[PDB]
Amino acid sequence: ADKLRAACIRIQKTIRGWLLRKRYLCMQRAAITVQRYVRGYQARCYAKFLRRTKAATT
């Protein structure tokens, strides 16, 4: 309840926020990166499956 205190509090909330935001955005990018590779490899497995059964297709 005073100028030094308020000034400090305004700074602390901005830092606390920025840190968490930064970590969040980062976790988000990482998730998307893992997600595209997951979708990528499962699709390749599926296509392999199709290739395998096409040969058997008469």
């Binding site: 000034a7 400090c8 305004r10 602390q12 830092i15 606390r16 926020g17 968490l20 935001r21």
Partner: protein
């Protein structure tokens, strides 16, 4: 006005990350984390106010609808870059626009809503600030925006 479809999607994403079992709630304890992860900078006091205005019951949880209200509310009252800069200059003896990295750490951990040593360390790390240097807080504020 009110939250856009896009903003709603953004907040549900983060909210659902902390909603441990998809039941539609997050603990009142982590309301700050979620709001912060989404880019809002509330004080520990405001957090406690928001909580109070929803946790009379004492269950200690918050649902998505109220969370969206808190977000829209808090969003209306957002500090500018200059307001943050000004906060810095009260600790900026001579109006040069800098502040000892040592002084900063002292205020962060001793005044207001005292940061942890871990949080101050993290700050210095993530901001690539010289532990024994000067912080061009005008830029530091830009960096955090």
């Amino acid at each position: 006005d009110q939250l856009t479809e896009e903003q709603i999607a953004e907040f549900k994403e983060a909210f659902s990350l902390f909603d441990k079992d998809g039941d539609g709630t997050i603990t009142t304890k982590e309301l700050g984390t979620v709001m912060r992860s989404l880019g809002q900078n509330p004080t520990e006091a405001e957090l406690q106010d928001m909580i109070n205005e929803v946790d009379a019951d004492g269950n200690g949880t918050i649902d998505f609808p109220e969370f969206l209200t808190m977000m829209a509310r808090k969003m209306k009252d957002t500090d500018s870059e200059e307001e943050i800069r000004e906060a810095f200059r009260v600790f900026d003896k001579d109006g040069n626009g800098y502040i000892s990295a040592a002084e900063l750490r002292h205020v962060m951990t001793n005044l207001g809503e005292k940061l942890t040593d871990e949080e101050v360390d993290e700050m210095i790390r993530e901001a690539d600030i010289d532990g024994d240097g000067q912080v061009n807080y005008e830029e530091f504020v830009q960096m955090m925006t």
